[PDB]
C-alpha cells in the first residue's frame, strides 16, 4: 500500500515546464526530483524526490494500453506522442533497479536550416539534386538527423513530390508544405526496414529517406531507388567518403562487387561524413565535415575499383565543386579556433597531412 | 472519439475522379487533401485535409475482412481490385505516424505496344521465339514490367498457348485472347516464388513468366522450363548482358558452373538490359536498352567460359542480329537529343568507348 | 512430511548477524549450520544444521512470487534486495543434491576510494575525462567492478551528468549525488545487453557503463557513444592493453578493421588491465595493474596497424602520462614485498624482461 | 491383465542384498532374475525370471511422479536416490525391447584415498595447491572420478573453504567436513554446465569442480576461476599433458590463442592424464599415469607456443618435481609386472622410446 | 462404404502360412493376393486379390493404438512383434497409392553360426576378444547384421557379461544365455543413437553394439567404451579397412586427428569389410570379406598417419594373423567358382593386382 507523492505534478505540467524553459530532455527516475536539460545543463525541478509509484504513473500516463502491455513484456518502450497545443515528444520508458524510469525529449516544430547548422553551401546544392543517391554518414549522434531534416525541409518547400521516410526512430517531424510527406517509424509504423522497403516502390515516392544501410537488402533497395529516378537519402556509420564507398561494395559477394561499383558510379550524387567535436570551450560541440561530390574522374575511379584515389580528387576539388576533406574541415576549424589542436589531431585520419597544412 | 470529415467523399468518387482526370496515382494520407498525380505532377483535390478517421475509412472501404486482419497484424498490405465500370487498381496501405495511409494506382486496360515503348524491332522478333530462355534485366522501375507486358500481350494475341505468370506483384493484367492466361500474384495467389514454381510443370504451361531469378532454385526451374520446350520469360537486376550471364553462373557451386553454362548456351534466346534515364528536360524518362541475341559464336563463348568476350560480338551485331550495346543505345539517344551528355556518360560502363564513338 | 528445525532463526536474524559480525558472505545449505565468511574465513553459526525445509524457507523468504516461479522453472535465481535499516544484499539461490541452497552477499553502502584500492593517481586522472572510451579489462573477479565503482562514484560526485550503467549483475549501488544515476541489471531490469543498448541513445545519457564487450554489436555501441561526446566505460576479459586493442579489432570483418582502428585511435582515452594476485602471505590479494594512456604516438600506432609496438610507448610513459606496464607493476609489487617472485614471474608475459628490471 | 511374479521381492530387499554382498551393480531386466555385480562378476539372484510388470514396478518404486513423467516422455532416466540407513545409489532406467529396464549402482559413503588408488605422492601435493587450474584427464571410466573424489576429500578435510561442484553426473558424494560442499548434478540440479557456471562466481566458492571442458564457454569459465584465486578442478577427454594443452588452445579462434596460452601458462598447476589398463591377470585393472607439473621453463614453453617441447621437461623432471611421462608409468608397470608387454606397447604413444627404456 | 474380401484370412493365418512354408517375407498390398517369398521367389497365395480395406485391416491387426496413431501421422511405421507359438516378426507398414501396404519378415529364433555364414576362423577369434573396438563395415544389406548377430551369440554363450545393443532396427534377437542382454531399438526403445549413448556408461555394460558411426559424437562414445575396458562392436558403411580408418579420422577437426589416430591405434582390435556378391548362378549371394587384424606394425602405421600403407601388412598377414584383403577374398571365391570373373573384377579396388594373383 504505497502512494504517490503529496500533491504530485502530472506529466502535462512537467512537459509544459520542459518546453517553457526551452529544455530538451525530461528525466523521470526514482529518488530524484524530475530533472530537465536546458542547453546541456541538467537541472532538478523544485519538487520532492520521486518514488517508484510516481515513476510508473507518470510514464504510464502518456501510454496507450497496447504500449503498456508491450513495455511490461519487454521492459523497454520507445515512442512518440503529442500533447495538444504544446509539443510533440519522444519517450523512452525502461526499468532500472526494479523501478520504472523514463526519458522524454522535445520534438521541435521548427527545423534548423543549413545557415543555422553552419553547413556549407554545397550541402544546399545537394538538396537540389533531382535524382540519385545521397549518403549522409557518421556515428549516430553526429548531427546526421539535423542534416537530413534540413535537406528534407528544403525539398518539401521547393518541390511538389512525395516524400516517404523510414526512420529508426523518427527524429524531426515534417508538416506538408509543397510535398506530401509520409514518415514511417521502424518498430511502430513498420516492423522493420526490410518490411517498409518491400513496398516502397508501390507507394509512388519521389524522395526516400532510408534510415541506415544495415545489410545487403537495404543497400540494394537504396541503389534501386536511385537507379530509377528517385532521390534516395541514406545513412552509414562510416567516417570518410572512401570508407563509406568501400563499405558499400565490400559487404557484397565478390562476384557482385563489379556491378555494385558500376551502380554506385552511376547513381552516387554526394557523400557527406560528419563528426561533432567539442569546442574549445568544452561546453558545446562543432561539426566537422567531409564532402565528396562525384565528378567524371571520380565516377571512373569508383567503377574501375581505384576507390582510395578518390581522396586526391577531394583535395583539389573544393572551390569549383564544393568538395572538402575532413582534414580541410579540421584545418578550417583550427583557423577559426573552434576546436583544439589535440582534438583535431586525434580525429584526423592523417595527422601528418594536417600537420603539413598547418605549416601552411 | 473522433468523426470523419464533413460530407466526406468515398473511394468510388475519389478513384472515379482519378481516372477521369487522366491520373495515375491517388494518395490518401492525413493533414493533406487527397492528392492525384497527373503526367508526373502531384495535384491536391478541391476538398479539406483528411484526418486519421478519413484515411482509415477510405483505405478500409476497398478491403475484405481478411485483408483488414492481414493489414492490422502486418502494418503492410498490398493488393489489386476493380471498380466495375471504371478500372482495375493496385492499392497499398501502410501506417505512417500512427495513421493509415494509402497509395492507389491505375492498372490500365490497354497494354502499350513496342512502338509506343520505343522498343526496337529486335524485341518484337524475340517475342516470336517458340522456345528457350529470355531475360529482361534491370532495376525494378526501369520498365521491365511494361516490356514484359508487351511481349506477353503479343504472345497472347498470336499463339494458342497456356501462359502462366508468377508476379510480385502483378503490374499489368491480361484478358484471354488466343492463349489461356493464368497469373499468380506472390503474396496473394501463391505464398512465394518457391511454392508457385514447385508445381509449374504440373500446370501444363507453354509460356512462363518466372519473375526475378532470386535463388538457385528459381534459376534451375527457369532453365528446366527453357530446356524442355517452354518459353521462359524472366528477370534479373543486372545492368548488362555480360553481367547478367555471369550472375546466372556465379551463384552456383563451382562444380555445377560447367553444367549451367552449357545449359545457358543451349537455351538462352535473348537478354535485354534496361535503364530509364531522365530526358534532357528532366520532366520525363527515356529508355536505354542493351540487347544481346545469341549466335553460334556467343553460345560457344558462354559454354567455354569466355563470357567477357560476348561484348565484342554485340558491337558488330546490329544489322544481322539486332543486337545493341548499352553504349550504342546511349549513343543513339544522344544523336536524337533525348538524353544529355552528363547523364549518358555517368551511366556508361565504358565512358572512353562512348567518347570514341561520339568522335565519329 | 517434514518440518523446519526447532525455533529456527529467520533470514532477517541471519543477515543481521552477518552484517553485525563484519561478514561478507552468508551460506545457506543443508547438513550445515548457516555459515558466514569474515575477512576470508568461513565460520559456522552457533545453531543446529539446516535441513531441506530450512533452506527452502529461508531462501524463499527473501523472494517475490515471480522470483519463486522464475527459480522453480530454472533452478537458478540471482537477485538484489534490501532489509530496511540494515543493508542491501545480493542473493543467489540454486539447487544442489535436490535441495535449495543460498549464498548471500553484502552490498556495501560506502564505495571504496582509489587510495583504498591502491589505484595509482593516473586512474583518478582518467576518471576526470570528459569524453571517449575507457576500458577496464581482466577476469571477472580481478576487481573490475570495484575499479569501475570508484570511477563512477567520483564522476557522480563531481559532474552534473546522467549516468546509465548496464550490469551483469550490479555489484555496487550508487545514490544520486550530483549526477542522475540509472542502473539496469541484465536478467532483471533489462533482458540483455542487446536490449538495453538498443535504446541507450534515446535515454539522454552522458556517461555509460556498458559492461563486457561480448559482441560486434556491443563494441559498436560503445564506439558510437565514445565518438559522439559521451564517456563510455567498458570491460573486456583481456590481460593487457595490446591484447585488449587487438581483440577489439580482430572480431570484426577484415574490411571493417581499418575503420575500427581509426575509431579506436580517436576515442580511446585509456585502458586498464588488472590482476588480483595472492600476497606473499596467501591470506589476501594485491592488485597488479597495467595502464595505457594514449598519446599522439600511440593513436598513430593503432590507426596504422602497428599495435604490438604500443608496448614500447608504455615502458617510458610513467612520468609524463602515468602509464605502466604489467611488468612495471609486478616489479613495483616485488620492491614493496607485496607478492612473491614465483607468483610474479608466473604472471609475467615477459619473464626475461622482469628479471632484467630486477637486476637493476 | 498381467501380474507380477509370485511373492516378488521389492527394491528395498534387492538393494539391501546388493549392499550386503559388497556388490556394485544391480541389473533389473526381463527374462532374467535380478543380477548383482560383486567385484566384477555378474551373479543371478536365486529368484524367478522377471517379467515386464516386475521391471516397471521395481524401477518405478524408486521414482517420484515428476521423474516418472520425465522417463515416459524420454524413455531415458538417470538419477541418484538414498535408502535411509542403507546407502545412496545411482539409477538408470530405460526401455529395451518394449519393456522397462534398470541399472542401479552403489554410491559409497567412504571415498578411496590416494594410497588406496595407488596414486603417487605428487597427486597429494597437487591437492594442496591453494590456487589455479588442475586438469585430470582421460576417457570417462579411466578413474578420473575416483581421483577427483580423493582430491576433494582431502581439501574438504584440510581447508575451511566453499567447495562447489558441477557434475554430469555426481559420482561420489561428500559430507561436510571442514569445507562447505555444494554438489550440483547436471540435468537435475542444474540444466547444463552453461547454466551452473553462469552464476558460479555469485556463489562465493573457493574450490570448483567443473565436470568436463566441453566448449569455449566452459574453458573460459575454468580459466577465469583459476585466474582470480580459486582452485579450479576440471576434466578433458585427452591422453597426454601435451594433447591436453593443445586441445585447450586449439578450439579457440586463432586471434585468441596467444591470450589463452598466456592464461594457461599463468594458471596451470598440474595436468594428470589417466588410463586404466588390464592387469596381466585379465581380471582387474591398473592405472597408468602421466603427470605434468608446471615449472618456470614449461610456463615459458606454453606461452611461446612450443607446446610439444614440454614432454622433454617431463622426462627429466620426475624426482624433484614429481613429473612422469606415460611411457615412464608404463615402464614402471612392466617392472612390477602389473601389465603385459603387448598392452603396454599398444597404449604407448611412443613404442620406440618405451622399447629403448626397456633396453635399460 | 466398402467391405473386406469374403471370408478373408487374418494375419495369424497368413503368418502361420508364411512360416510353415519356409518363407521369409510376406507382402500385403492391394490388387494382389498375399505374396510370400520362399528361398528368393515371390509366390502368390491361393486366395483372391486384396482390396484397400483388407490391407488396412490386416496391417492394423498387428498394431497397438499408439502404433496406429504414429502411422497415421507419419505414413510410415516399422516394428517388431511376436505370435505366441509361432515366431517373432518384423513388420513394415506404409502408404502406396492411397492404400495401406505391409511387408512382414520372419525373425529366426536360431542364430546362424560362423561356419554356416562362411566366415573364416579369424572372425571367431575376434569374437573372443576381451576389450577394444571391433568394426564390421559395408553397405546395410551386406550381412553386417548376421555377422554381428553371430559374434554376439558367441559372446552371450561364452561370457558372463552385460551386453547392450543399440540397433536400427533390431535384426536378430538374443535370449539370455550366460550374459545379460539388453537390446534397444532406435525409433522405439530409444529415440536416437544420441539418446541411447548419452547414458550407456551408466548402464554397466561390458559389451556394446553401437551401430553405425554416424556422428562425431557416436564415434567418440565408441572410442570411449573401447578405451575403458569394454568391447565395442560397431558399424560403418566403408568398403575397406583403409577406407574405414580414414573415415574415422577425417570427420574430426584437424587438431583432434592426432588424438583419434592415437586412440584408434590403441583400441582397434579388428576391422571387417563385407560384400554380398551374386553367385555365378545369380540366384543367390556369396560373401566377400576383407579382414584387418592389427599388429604392432599396423598400430604404428595408424598413429604415425601412414594409413594407406596398412594394406601392405594385410597382404602378408594370413598365416599369422588371419588377415585377408578384399582381393585375396575375391581370389578365393574365384578358385572355388563361387563368383564370376566379371563380378569379381568390377568389385575389385585393384583389378591389376587381382589379375596378377590369378596369373600365379
From TrEMBL, chains A, B, C, D, E:
Residues 201-215 form the Bacterial type II secretion system protein E domain. SUPFAM superfamilies: P-loop containing nucleoside triphosphate hydrolases. Transmembrane segments: none annotated. Pfam families: T2SSE. One of its GO terms (molecular function) is ATP binding. SMART domains: AAA. PROSITE patterns: T2SP_E. Belongs to the GSP E family. This is Twitching motility pilus retraction protein. It comes from Geobacter sulfurreducens (strain ATCC 51573 / DSM 12127 / PCA). The lineage of its organism: Bacteria, Pseudomonadati, Thermodesulfobacteriota, Desulfuromonadia, Geobacterales.
Amino acid at each position: 500500500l504505497y502512494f504517490q507523492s503529496a500533491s504530485m505534478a502530472n506529466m502535462h505540467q512537467l512537459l509544459t515546464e520542459l518546453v517553457n524553459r526551452g529544455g530538451s530532455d525530461l528525466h523521470i527516475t526514482t529518488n530524484s526530483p524530475p530533472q530537465i536539460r536546458v542547453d546541456g545543463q541538467l537541472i532538478p525541478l523544485e519538487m520532492p524526490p520521486l518514488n517508484a509509484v510516481d515513476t510508473k504513473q507518470l510514464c504510464y500516463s502518456i501510454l496507450t494500453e497496447q504500449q503498456k502491455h508491450k513495455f511490461e513484456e519487454a521492459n523497454e518502450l520507445d515512442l512518440s506522442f503529442g500533447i495538444k497545443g504544446l509539443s510533440r515528444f519522444r519517450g523512452n520508458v525502461f526499468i532500472q533497479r526494479g523501478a520504472v524510469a523514463g526519458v522524454f525529449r522535445v520534438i521541435p516544430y521548427k527545423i534548423l536550416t543549413f545557415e543555422e547548422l553552419g553547413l556549407p553551401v554545397v550541402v544546399k546544392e545537394l538538396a537540389e539534386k533531382p535524382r540519385g543517391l545521397i549518403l549522409v554518414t557518421g556515428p549516430t549522434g553526429s548531427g546526421k538527423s539535423t542534416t537530413l531534416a534540413a535537406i528534407i525541409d528544403k525539398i518539401n518547400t521547393e518541390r511538389h513530390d512525395h516524400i516517404v521516410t523510414i526512420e529508426d526512430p523518427i527524429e524531426y517531424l515534417h508538416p506538408h508544405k509543397s510535398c506530401v510527406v509520409n514518415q514511417r517509424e521502424v518498430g511502430a509504423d513498420t516492423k522493420s526496414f526490410k518490411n517498409a522497403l518491400k513496398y516502397i516502390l508501390r507507394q509512388d515516392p519521389d524522395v526516400v529517406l532510408v534510415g541506415e544501410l544495415r545489410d545487403l537488402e537495404t543497400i540494394e533497395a537504396a541503389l534501386t531507388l536511385a537507379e530509377t529516378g528517385h532521390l534516395c537519402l541514406a545513412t552509414l556509420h562510416t567516417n570518410s567518403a572512401v570508407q563509406t564507398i568501400n563499405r558499400i561494395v565490400d559487404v557484397f559477394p565478390p562476384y557482385q562487387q563489379p556491378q555494385v561499383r558500376a551502380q554506385l558510379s552511376f547513381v552516387l550524387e554526394g557523400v557527406m561524413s560528419q563528426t561533432l567535436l567539442p569546442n574549445v570551450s568544452g561546453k558545446g560541440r562543432v561539426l566537422a565535415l567531409e564532402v565528396m561530390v562525384p565528378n567524371p574522374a571520380i565516377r571512373n575511379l569508383i567503377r574501375e575499383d581505384k576507390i582510395h584515389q578518390i581522396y586526391s580528387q577531394m583535395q583539389v576539388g573544393q572551390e569549383k565543386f564544393g568538395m572538402q576533406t575532413m582534414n580541410q574541415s579540421l584545418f578550417s576549424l583550427l583557423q577559426k579556433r573552434r576546436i583544439s589542436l589535440d582534438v583535431a589531431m586525434a580525429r584526423s585520419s592523417d595527422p601528418d597531412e594536417l600537420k603539413q597544412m598547418l605549416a601552411s
